[PDB]
Design a protein around this ligand. Structure first.
Ligand SMILES: [Zn+2]
Ligand SMILES: [Zn+2]
Length: 90
């Protein structure tokens, strides 16, 4: 065996594990309905790859990342936009 318990610093932006069909048929979080096909497991729960969308830009948050805040998922874009308030030309 070996030892670890060590890691590097990274951004909060988390991701969802794309689960294939057949593997498992958990219960969605939004609609709360048994999933037959592939689902996304994140935040300690499952969701539909068709509904799973941002809270502001309501965009597909399957590939891109997302950040939770007081019960709200914000894609890296939204976050970096609000959170990481960089310099504004105007
Ligand atoms: Zn659903
Ligand atoms: Zn967004």
């Amino acid at each position: 065996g070996s030892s670890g318990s060590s890691g590097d610093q990274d951004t909060l932006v988390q991701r969802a594990e794309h689960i294939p069909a057949g593997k498992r048929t958990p219960m969605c979080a939004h609609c709360n309905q048994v999933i037959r096909g592939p689902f996304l497991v994140a935040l300690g729960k499952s969701w539909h790859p068709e509904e799973f969308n941002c809270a502001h830009c309501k965009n597909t948050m399957a590939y891109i990342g997302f950040v939770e805040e007081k019960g709200a998922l914000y894609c890296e874009l939204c976050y970096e936009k609000f959170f990481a308030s960089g310099p504004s030309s105007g």
